[PDB]
Amino acid sequence: DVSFRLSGADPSSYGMFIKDLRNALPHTEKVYNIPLLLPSVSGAGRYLLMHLFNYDGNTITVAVDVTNVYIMGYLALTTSYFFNEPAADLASQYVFRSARRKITLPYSGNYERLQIAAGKPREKIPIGLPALDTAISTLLHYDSTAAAGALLVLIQTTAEAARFKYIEQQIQERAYRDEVPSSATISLENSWSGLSKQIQLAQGNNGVFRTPTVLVDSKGNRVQITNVTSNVVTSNIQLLLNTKNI
Numbered sequence: 001d002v003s004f005r006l007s008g009a010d011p012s013s014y015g016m017f018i019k020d021l022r023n024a025l026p027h028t029e030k031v032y033n034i035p036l037l038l039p040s041v042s043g044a045g046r047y048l049l050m051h052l053f054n055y056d057g058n059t060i061t062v063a064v065d066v067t068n069v070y071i072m073g074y075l076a077l078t079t080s081y082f083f084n085e086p087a088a089d090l091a092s093q094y095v096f097r098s099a100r101r102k103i104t105l106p107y108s109g110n111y112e113r114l115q116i117a118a119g120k121p122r123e124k125i126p127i128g129l130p131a132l133d134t135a136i137s138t139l140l141h142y143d144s145t146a147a148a149g150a151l152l153v154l155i156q157t158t159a160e161a162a163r164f165k166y167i168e169q170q171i172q173e174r175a176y177r178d179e180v181p182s183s184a185t186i187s188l189e190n191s192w193s194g195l196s197k198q199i200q201l202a203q204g205n206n207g208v209f210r211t212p213t214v215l216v217d218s219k220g221n222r223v224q225i226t227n228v229t230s231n232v233v234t235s236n237i238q239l240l241l242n243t244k245n246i
């Protein structure tokens, strides 16, 4: 399991949690020095438990699929909650079985569905450590519309930061003041599958992407990534989605 406490949290302790989260995900190989997530994991081992504590010490446990860093559901006191998707119903076979009741949320976990439920696109939702304290608080008691926006904050401040060093640094900058994600952040989120795939295909193509990936940079400018020498690959990306899962 891994844990993070918002009480006393600072850029350093958040970085330690993001490091713990990455190091909890199993891999057999690195590709271009980036951990390659496994094609498949059977049974309860598929799921990582993240214990998150809000500023007041109240807690939820979040179940993450270790092959793809996707959140499946979470436990809040005696109630479990899962996305309305088959991978999450599958997870509910293994985690939080001891919950008194299980609620299936009225959306899947993908960004488009969650933005619809929340009434707002990600571009308009501030993120940061205060926002994560709020999301934990919101998830403690069911409210499906509030929970969709809480889950957009939770996904970006845990899974997305685990996948990209740039996104982890953006959250660190927001340790004490929330701010909507930078356009580069949204770009990286959206490109993780693309990138993971192109980095894997470069292995027999001399480091060259079969298909270039378009990103927005830190300055708001629209760069084109063509090969493994890009900073996005040498410095930023930290986990690769296996191409078996793409």
Ligand SMILES: CCCCCCCCCCC[C@@H](O)CC(=O)N[C@H]1[C@@H](OP(=O)(O)O)O[C@H](CO)[C@@H](O)[C@@H]1OC(=O)C[C@H](O)CCCCCCCCCCC
Residues within 6 Å of the ligand: 069, 070, 071, 072, 083, 084, 085, 086, 108, 109, 110, 111, 112, 113, 155, 159, 160, 188, 189, 190, 191, 192, 194
């Ligand atoms: C009876 C009916 C049966 C069932 C109901 C349905 C089945 C629905 C399955 C949805 C599964 C979903 O949870 C997996 C997923 O996708 N997750 C998002 C993200 O996972 P997190 O927990 O968010 O890490 O992992 C990704 C990491 O960033 C993130 O992108 C994901 O969300 C999406 O992909 C949603 C939209 O597809 C993207 C929204 C942006 C729109 C702009 C296009 C993106 C640019 C693509 C590059 C050209």
Ligand SMILES: *[C@@H]1O[C@H](CO)[C@@H](O[C@@H]2O[C@H](CO)[C@@H](O)[C@H](O)[C@H]2NC(C)=O)[C@H](O)[C@H]1NC(C)=O
Residues within 6 Å of the ligand: 226, 227, 228, 229, 230, 231
């Ligand atoms: C591999 O990647 C780098 C991009 O990071 C490319 O080098 C760039 O080349 C373009 C050519 O238009 C320039 O605009 C950039 O200024 C260069 N940047 C750096 C850091 O070198 C390179 O073109 C790519 N190589 C291959 C073989 O496709």
